């Protein structure tokens, strides 16, 4: 027997954030957006450069080890299945004349991945957004691969 | 900032005018109607007086059918199971060769492109990104491509392509050495049947009817049935194709034996569909196919559907079986039934058996009496079974039987009663509803003593359930009340005290009205209560709602009141009751958001039931009539005029000569109304008046009338033409002297052209 | 501006926000929200077609410069009728000049 | 399209009535319009329509012209004495046997 | 009737229930399809009067409004002895006209 | 395709606003509009076959309309060819605009 | 979100005669994995192609996108296939044995 | 009185606020918006047909 | 008849009411000005009151909820009763939620006349 | 830090408009009926309403 | 493209009727056809380039 | 019954059929016990159709019950489920077995007497 609770149950959560039988933990927040500046990801593996990925095209990008649902399968078994989410967010700013503006900004966020995401080789806080700036480097868990982020004029 | 205009806030607008496809009214329950595909050519057993079998023909026989079904079901269970440990499913190459037709060569182009194909899914999203002025060079390929067949050929829609595609290219008939392929080509006259002018249709239809046997079944059906499987079938196209399939069925008599199961797999949906004429068609043609192909063929062919998993086909099968049993006579098919109902493998078989019996009774009706005993024996074994659905459906069967075999046959049911009366006390929810429907129908078949005891028993439970909210609960109790508490052998005040208060409290609600059937059912049940108890009480209960707003509600109440006084007559009512009655009538009349014959007839019948006791109310009747007659019209004018029509009898016999001459001349004034729908009703009134107040007393002296009439004859509109002609004839026949030879001969040559 | 504001709220902007504007502006701001906005996105050169209409349609058209659709309706004359009646003397004064009181409809409101 | 019966009635009607009142004429046959009668007569029926195959010289002229005055068939067809329909289809035919 | 040869009659044993015609069809004989000299009444098969069909126009299928009769001829040649003349096929005409209706308007 | 075609059709079906009297060709054109309204892909097939094959057409009728100060011509084309031209014209303008053929200074423009 | 007539089976018309299956595998390749491709052979079918994706989603993407493609001076006709009938039996033998393999394989019953 | 605070509650006839712990996603048969759109379009055609009445 | 037909019933009823355009005061809902209890049926056997209240708060606050589970095995019987704060909210819920698909199971929603407090 | 595992509202930050704005007017021709001048098309509302 | 082009040009070459007179309009352009507007605006732009000169 | 445009496929098939040899000795069932016979039929068909088919079994049983079964009609009615030639066979082996049990005194057939 079980007493009737007032607590939750994944039902709605499951159906609403489910895909292909592999429920995704993360949702795009309303400021999902696509950029004007065309962002490119330059992969490297111990000074060996790998072909660039053009990731200006979607608002969200899933990185992990599960090739099915992930945008980018980072094949290091030290990578959890659903690992990190690249995300464009339209974040407000102040124009130098004081008038308020917003730019599509690229932000990476980790889903409590196992072994840690390294931003310029610092492990970042999970379930939290971190902006990516020009030339910056990324490393997930202890993978032997590293990445540098640029865009067209960068 | 034209960017703002470019940004469209929140697709082809021919949707207003293009005709509907049946893919729209569909639900998910019919959504199975297309996920069915045609099978491999099926083998006829009756070939060559019962020929001995040649092997290796790939012509499916019963053995292959049942084995194929076993593999299907088992494999489905295994799929469900391997799910528990862990349409998009990929396929096999044999699966593909079963998908594709012939004349196509398979290709992996390279082993490198097939390896590029290996990278295809690989990392498709990641890729390197993706003009100017340049003159052109003249070439002819665009001019060369053709998208419509050449000749006196109808336009070929963009979605009928994958069917009719052959007709696009051209090639000589002799070069079409596969003279069967020649046959196919000329058979694609089907397109002319489908789209084309009426003459194309007629000529094509004759062509195909008479060249039918020359063509033969195989080609015909292999090129018809894909059409009927089209999702984009509209209505016309469909009924046309069923027309043809019928006519060719009347020519090919036996040759269909291999093709029955295909024919059913497509026709069946017509059995369950909201169109009426579609049901009657599909039913009729299954009858004809059952008569054409021999019984044994039908039986052997559509057995394996009994057990089929998806309920859609189980249900539609049961209905089909009932039809064929009507065609070939029950006592033939009965043994097969007896087998099915007492099948033992799985209970779905039994359920479908019992369903068959239900549908028979429903369809054939009183043609059942000589077999009633055998049927009930067949079916009662489910009355007690521990499965729940079989019990419910069985009870519904019994009730259908009874409602067909009214008063008779009770000695055959006697065997089944006690299980009914057993289950009735101790069931809950659904089974209660069913068992109640059964005992309901049974009661009148009983004999006044047996039945009186049984009745007063059941009305106990019945009382208890008026307040149940469940829909079919309410409906079943409606029909039952009608029967039991509408029986000869019961008493006034018993009903009057214990039944009427809860009945009227609960059942008279606006939610009932908005439903379609409940409307009829409730009206009839109230009517029955009246024919038992006499009017005064019932009427006095529901009179006041005539002054409710809700229009369907007023409609129902007046239509009841009408039918009641149609039976009982107005002998009963006091003064004050009739006061409220009249007032409600007028009020309801004073709002007619639709043209509704109901309230009008209600009025007329109420009056001609009242007789002269109405006389006081006349002027307000007339005041209504007159203010209406002038009010901003469309409806309300011709409305009031019709009322006048039906009320003429009383509003003369009660001697309102001031009013009579009024109405006469007043109408006479309207004869210029430019709206025919009104002018007609005017003339109709005028006819009604004259038919009581004889010729020589009319205030518009007939001599004055008629010249006013002759010019209306040119009116060319149906209603005016008719009503005017009828009036003119009544006059020319009865009055007929107050006119000139000139008037006549004018009407003479004025009539001569009405025959259009 | 209001567009950017409803964005910063992520809230969708309602009819109150436009009630003032509903009919100002040279494209007649209410043209955004017609039923057909979408097809009329694919109509171009409607102005020059409206000119060259004079060579196919026989009668002469005084509104050749505009189109009621992509341009709204740039004038509104509901006041004019009111102020006329007002300066004619009001409905009573006017009716004095006619056969109204003759037919004796108990009131004029039913004038249809 | 036109059927030989309507065709004959046209011949007779024209030779009686003269080429100028097409209203009376088209009133005669049902499902025929005055514009259509005029067109058909000048296009096919009238005797002056020369109905034979193309000489070599006629095809020389045709080809040469349709090269000189692109797609203007109602301008050409008087110059070689056939209808726009004849000139048109027949130039199509020459072009197809060439390619 | 004599006009659409694709039509069928019940042709079982007559009974005691009289037959009725719609207001639309009314005024005619059922078989000789004339409009005159009604002599004798129609009687219909038990089934063809069972069920909702109490009081239906034999031909049009609609509401019973009046009685159905037999012309003097048909009763002189005794075509009036073939049991229910109830037409147990609806016929193409009603179907097709309704379908074209639903198409048009 | 259908967006354009409906635009063109509304344009044509405009002229017969009053719709009190009528003429033979006019009534024919009303019918043609309606039939094309039922089966778009029918009309679109016919249209494209026209643009592909026919290069010799019927004859147009002229007549002058009079403004008392200078007459102005007014033509009349056959109905089928009307419909086809209407479509082709919407199409040409839609593209030409999208691809910015007509530079800014060519100025019976859509915006003002 | 799919109109349920969409399928991994596409039907293609207006095909240039003797195109390279290489060329074509590329054309339909930018859209998704190709389960298989067949071209007509007889003069009637010569010039038409049934192309089968391995996914309904790449299928819909392609059919909606490349629809009306200009190849070799001609526009390409694409369509969804109505695989509404069959041409062979289902081979009870092979089906039965592969399923026996499955049942003894995962020890289900 | 913990009250809904999340992004955007769709409109209703009564325009009532969603509950304290509204899970915060729209699950609705859409019948609301259907009735709203039809509500506006009735007034639209009323105006359009009047314009004809005076003609 | 199986219950999904009883969802078809209520949806047909609503649309018919709009079809006749009948006024709200005579709308079939009007007969229950006296109840804030609405019946839910066809719930999947998994939903607990947390999820039910979360989802159905969409039109107001909930006064009470009673989810009939079988007491011996404690497990949900798949139907429940809900007391909203204000009749209007229940009208909205009956209109909008009758027919929504939760975990495949199309739930049916309705008024309740004489809610029985268990 | 963001709390995750919430049910996703498929919502954008871009401005939307509520259904009461749209469809407030329907029609595709100019209101001028092709320069028709017999017809009374001066105002657009009944003086009473 | 050349197919559209030949359509337009050929349509501008027709027989012009008035109660009894005829001729074939082979020089000018028929302002009255539904696409006379595009042709006129084109020919305009051409002569515009003549007046301005490509530079300006 | 109602229509004379479709041909009675009973008479038609009875004419054009190829029947078995001994199906003409009339047979009553009162002279016979059945539940002895049934398992023979059971196993026989279960072999012929290579699985179990409750409805076919009960079909033959119910065909057998009336005081006089028609071997022609039962031949036909089975022709659908069986191979058609297997029909005439199975008949050519049953019908005599009924003859045996009916000439018997107990009502039991001879081969099952030896068995
Ligand atoms: Zn007769
Ligand atoms: Zn009968
Ligand atoms: Zn009738």
């Amino acid at each position: 027997k079980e007493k009737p609770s007032f607590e939750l149950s994944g039902a709605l959560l499951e159906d609403t954030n489910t895909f292909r039988g592999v429920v995704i933990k993360y949702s795009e927040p309303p400021e999902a957006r696509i950029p004007k500046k065309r962002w490119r990801l330059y992969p490297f593996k111990n000074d060996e450069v790998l072909p660039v990925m053009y990731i200006h095209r979607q608002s969200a990008y899933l990185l992990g080890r599960h090739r099915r649902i992930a945008d980018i399968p980072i094949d290091h078994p030290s990578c959890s299945k659903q690992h990190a989410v690249f995300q464009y967010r339209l974040v407000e700013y102040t124009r130098a004349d004081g008038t308020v503006g917003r730019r599509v900004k690229p932000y990476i966020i980790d889903l409590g991945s196992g072994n840690g995401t390294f931003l310029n080789n610092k492990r970042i806080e999970p379930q939290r957004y971190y902006e990516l700036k020009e030339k910056d480097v990324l490393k997930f868990g202890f993978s032997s691969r590293e990445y540098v982020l640029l865009h067209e004029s960068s | 900032p034209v960017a703002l205009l470019n940004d469209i806030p929140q697709y082809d607008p021919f949707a207003e005018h293009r005709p509907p496809k049946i893919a729209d009214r569909e639900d998910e329950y019919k959504k199975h109607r297309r996920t069915m595909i045609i099978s491999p050519e099926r083998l006829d057993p009756f070939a060559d007086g019962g020929k001995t079998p040649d092997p290796k023909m790939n012509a499916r026989t019963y053995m292959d059918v049942m084995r194929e079904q076993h593999l299907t079901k088992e494999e489905r269970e295994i799929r469900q199971q391997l799910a528990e440990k862990a349409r998009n499913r990929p396929l096999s190459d044999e699966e593909l060769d079963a998908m594709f037709p012939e004349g196509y060569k398979v290709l992996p182009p390279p082993a490198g492109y097939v390896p590029i194909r290996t990278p295809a899914r690989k990392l498709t999203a990641t890729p390197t990104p993706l003009t100017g002025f340049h003159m052109q060079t003249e070439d002819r390929t665009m001019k060369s491509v053709n998208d419509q067949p050449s000749g006196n050929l109808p336009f070929l829609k963009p979605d009928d392509i994958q069917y009719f595609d052959k007709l696009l290219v051209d090639v000589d008939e002799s070069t079409l050495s596969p003279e069967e392929q020649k046959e196919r080509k000329i058979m694609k006259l089907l397109l002319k049947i489908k789209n084309g002018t009426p003459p194309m249709r007629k000529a094509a239809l004759r062509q195909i009817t008479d060249k039918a046997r020359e063509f033969g079944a195989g080609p015909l059906f292999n090129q018809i049935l894909p059409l009927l499987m089209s999702p984009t079938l509209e209505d016309q196209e469909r009924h046309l194709l069923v027309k043809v399939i019928d006519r060719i069925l009347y020519k090919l008599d036996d040759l269909v034996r291999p093709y029955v199961h295909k024919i059913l797999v497509v026709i069946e949906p017509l059995l369950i569909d909201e169109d009426y004429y579609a049901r009657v068609e599909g039913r009729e043609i299954i009858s004809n196919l059952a008569k054409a192909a021999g019984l044994a063929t039908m039986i052997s062919t559509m057995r394996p559907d009994i057990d089929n998993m998806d309920e859609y086909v189980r249900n539609t099968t049961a209905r089909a079986f009932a039809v064929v049993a009507s065609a070939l006579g029950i006592p033939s098919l009965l043994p097969f039934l007896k087998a099915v109902c007492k099948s033992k493998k799985s209970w779905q078989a039994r359920h479908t058996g019992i369903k068959i019996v239900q549908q028979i009774a429903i369809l054939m009706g009183c043609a059942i009496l000589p077999h009633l005993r055998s049927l009930v024996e067949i079916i009662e074994h489910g009355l007690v079974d521990e499965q729940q659905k079989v019990r419910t459906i069985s009870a519904l069967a019994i009730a259908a039987l009874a409602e067909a075999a009214t008063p008779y046959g009770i000695e055959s049911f006697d065997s089944v009663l006690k299980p009914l009366w057993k289950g009735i006390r101790q069931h809950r929810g659904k089974g209660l509803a069913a068992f109640l429907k059964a005992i309901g129908y049974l009661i009148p078949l009983m004999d006044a003593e047996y039945a009186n005891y049984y009745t007063r028993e059941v009305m106990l439970i019945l009382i208890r359930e008026f307040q149940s909210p469940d829909e079919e609960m309410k409906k079943i109790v409606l029909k039952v009340v009608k029967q039991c508490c509408g029986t000869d052998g019961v008493e006034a005040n018993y009903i009057k005290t214990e039944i009427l208060p809860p009945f009227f409290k609960h059942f008279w609600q606006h939610r009932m009205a908005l439903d379609r059937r409940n409307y009829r059912q409730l009206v009839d049940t109230t009517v029955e209560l009246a024919n038992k108890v006499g009017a005064a009480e019932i009427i006095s209960r529901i009179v006041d709602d005539l002054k409710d707003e809700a229009e369907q509600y007023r409609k129902m109440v007046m239509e009841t009141i009408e039918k009641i006084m149609g039976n009982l007559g107005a002998a009963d009512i006091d003064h004050k009751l009739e006061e409220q009655l009249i007032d409600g009538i007028l009020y309801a009349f004073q709002e007619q958001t639709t043209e509704d014959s109901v309230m009008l007839n209600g009025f007329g019948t109420v009056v001609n039931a009242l007789g002269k006791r109405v006389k006081p109310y006349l002027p307000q009747i007339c005041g209504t009539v007159l203010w209406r007659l002038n009010n901003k019209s469309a409806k309300v004018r011709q409305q009031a005029a019709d009322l006048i029509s039906r009320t003429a009898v009383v509003m003369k016999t009660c001697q309102e000569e001031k009013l009579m001459g009024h109405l006469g001349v007043v109408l006479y004034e309207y004869l210029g109304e430019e709206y025919p729908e009104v002018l007609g009703s005017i003339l109709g009134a005028l006819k009604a008046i004259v038919n009581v107040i004889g010729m020589h007393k009319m205030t518009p002296p007939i001599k004055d009338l008629l010249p006013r009439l002759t010019p209306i004859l040119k009116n060319r509109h149906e209603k005016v033409q008719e009503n005017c002609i009828d009036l003119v004839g009544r006059i020319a026949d009865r009055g007929a002297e107050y006119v000139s030879a000139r008037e006549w001969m004018r009407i003479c040559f004025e009539l001569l052209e009405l025959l259009k | 501006l209001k567009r950017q504001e409803a964005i910063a709220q992520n809230r969708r902007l309602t009819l109150e926000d436009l009630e003032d504007s509903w009919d100002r502006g040279i494209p007649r701001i209410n043209t955004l929200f017609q039923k057909d906005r979408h097809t009329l996105a694919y109509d171009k050169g409607w102005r020059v077609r409206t000119d060259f209409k004079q060579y196919q349609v026989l009668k002469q058209n005084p509104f050749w410069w505009t189109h009621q659709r992509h341009d709204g309706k740039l004038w509104n004359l509901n006041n004019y009728r009111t102020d006329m009646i007002q300066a004619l003397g009001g409905v009573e004064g006017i009716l004095e000049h006619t056969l109204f009181k003759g037919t004796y409809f108990p009131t004029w409101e039913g004038l249809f | 399209v036109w059927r030989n019966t309507e065709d004959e009635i046209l011949k007779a009607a024209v030779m009686k009535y003269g080429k100028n009142q097409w209203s009376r004429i088209a009133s005669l046959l049902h499902r025929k319009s005055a514009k259509q009668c005029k067109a058909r007569w000048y296009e096919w029926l009238d005797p002056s329509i020369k109905k034979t195959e193309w000489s070599r010289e006629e095809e020389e002229k045709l080809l040469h012209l349709a090269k000189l005055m692109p797609t203007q068939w109602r301008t050409i067809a008087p110059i070689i004495g056939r209808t726009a329909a004849q000139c048109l289809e027949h130039y199509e035919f020459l072009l197809d046997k060439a390619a | 009737a004599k006009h659409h040869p694709d039509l069928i009659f019940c042709r079982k044993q007559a009974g005691v229930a009289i037959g009725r015609l719609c207001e639309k069809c009314d005024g005619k004989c059922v078989i000789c399809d004339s409009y005159v000299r009604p002599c004798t009444l129609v009687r219909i098969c038990d089934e063809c009067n069972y069920g909702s069909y109490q009081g239906r126009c034999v031909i049009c299928g609609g509401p019973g409004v009046s009685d159905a009769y037999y012309c003097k001829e048909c009763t002189i040649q005794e075509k009036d002895r073939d049991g229910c003349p109830k037409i147990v096929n609806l016929g193409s005409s009603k179907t097709d006209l309704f379908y074209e209706r639903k198409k048009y308007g | 395709d259908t967006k354009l075609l409906i635009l063109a059709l509304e344009r044509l079906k405009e002229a017969y606003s009053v719709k009190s009297r009528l003429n033979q060709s006019q009534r024919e054109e009303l019918g043609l509009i309606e039939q094309a309204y039922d089966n778009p892909h029918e009309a679109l097939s016919r249209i494209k076959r026209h643009l592909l094959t026919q290069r010799a057409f019927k004859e147009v009728g002229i007549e002058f309309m009079d403004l008392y100060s200078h007459l102005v011509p007014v033509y009349d084309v056959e109905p089928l060819e009307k419909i086809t031209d209407a479509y082709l014209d919407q199409y040409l303008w839609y593209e030409a605009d999208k691809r910015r053929l007509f530079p800014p200074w060519i100025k019976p423009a859509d915006t003002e | 979100r799919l109109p349920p007539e969409v399928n991994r089976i596409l039907y293609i018309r207006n095909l240039p005669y003797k195109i390279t299956a290489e060329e074509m595998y590329d054309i339909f390749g930018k859209y998704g994995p190709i389960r298989q491709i067949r071209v007509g052979n007889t003069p009637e079918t010569r010039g038409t192609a049934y192309v089968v994706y391995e996914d309904i989603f790449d299928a819909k993407n392609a059919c909606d996108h490349l629809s009306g493609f200009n190849v070799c001076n001609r526009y390409l006709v694409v369509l969804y296939y109505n695989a509404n009938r069959a041409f062979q039996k289902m081979d009870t033998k092979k089906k039965e044995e592969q399923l026996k393999l499955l049942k003894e394989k995962y020890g289900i019953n | 009185r913990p009250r809904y605070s999340g992004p955007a509650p769709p409109p209703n006839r009564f325009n009532i606020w969603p509950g304290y712990r509204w899970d915060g996603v729209d699950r609705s048969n859409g019948f609301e918006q259907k009735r709203f759109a039809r509500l506006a379009s009735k007034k639209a055609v009323e105006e359009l047909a009047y314009k004809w009445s005076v003609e | 008849m199986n219950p999904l037909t009883k969802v078809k019933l209520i949806n047909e009823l609503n649309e018919r009411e709009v079809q006749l355009g009948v006024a709200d005061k005579v709308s079939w809902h009007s007969e229950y000005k006296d109840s804030a209890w609405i019946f839910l049926g066809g719930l999947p056997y998994e939903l607990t009151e947390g999820d039910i209240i979360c989802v159905f708060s969409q039109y107001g606050e909930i006064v009470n909820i009673n989810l009939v589970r079988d007491k011996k095995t404690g497990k949900s019987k798949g139907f429940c009763f809900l007391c909203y704060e204000d009749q209007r909210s229940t009208i909205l819920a009956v209109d909008n939620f009758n027919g929504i698909k939760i975990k495949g199971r199309t739930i049916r929603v309705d008024h309740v006349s004489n809610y029985r407090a268990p | 830090v963001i709390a995750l595992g919430v049910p996703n509202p498929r919502t954008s930050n871009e401005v939307q408009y509520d259904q009461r704005l749209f469809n407030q007017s329907k029609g595709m021709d100019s209101g001028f009926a092709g320069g028709e001048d017999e017809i009374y098309n001066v105002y657009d509302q009944a003086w009473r309403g | 493209d050349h197919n559209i082009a030949d359509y337009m040009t050929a349509k501008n070459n027709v027989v012009i009727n008035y109660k009894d007179m005829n001729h074939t309009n082979s020089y000018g352009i028929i302002r009255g056809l539904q696409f006379a507007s595009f042709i006129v605006q084109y020919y305009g732009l051409v002569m515009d380039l003549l007046v301005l000169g490509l530079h300006r | 019954e109602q229509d004379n445009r479709f041909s009675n496929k009973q008479k038609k098939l009875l004419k054009q059929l190829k029947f078995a040899e001994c199906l003409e000795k009339k047979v009553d069932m009162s002279k016979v016990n059945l539940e002895v016979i049934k398992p023979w039929i059971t196993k026989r068909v279960t072999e012929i159709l290579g699985f179990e088919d409750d409805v076919v079994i009960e079909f033959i049983f119910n065909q057998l019950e009336v005081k006089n079964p028609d071997s022609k009609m039962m031949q036909i009615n089975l022709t659908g489920f069986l191979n058609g030639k297997n029909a005439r066979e199975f008949m050519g082996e049953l019908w005599p077995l009924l003859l045996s049990a009916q000439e018997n005194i107990a009502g039991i057939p001879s081969a099952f007497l030896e068995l």
Side-chain angles (χ1 to χ4, degrees), chain L residues 22-68:
Chain L
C22 197
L23 262 65
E24 301 64 22
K25 291 76 191 139
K26 185 198 115 152
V27 155
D28 152 86
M29 205 54 47
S30 91
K31 313 201 98 90
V32 201
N33 158 3
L34 273 311
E35 55 291 349
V36 52
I37 332 223
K38 308 183 170 63
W40 171 58
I41 297 192
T42 320
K43 293 300 323 181
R44 174 56 190 182
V45 286
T46 318
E47 147 197 309
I48 315 164
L49 275 157
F51 55 74
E52 64 287 49
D53 189 291
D54 192 331
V55 193
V56 163
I57 328 301
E58 316 288 336
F59 191 20
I60 310 127
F61 294 12
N62 280 246
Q63 214 95 9
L64 259 171
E65 307 310 78
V66 318
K67 194 161 137 296
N68 185 326

Side-chain angles (χ1 to χ4, degrees), chain F residues 26 34 62 78 82 100 112:
Chain F
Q26 308 198 335
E34 220 62 26
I62 173 169
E78 222 58 27
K82 222 185 277 190
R100 267 185 285 127
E112 341 92 346

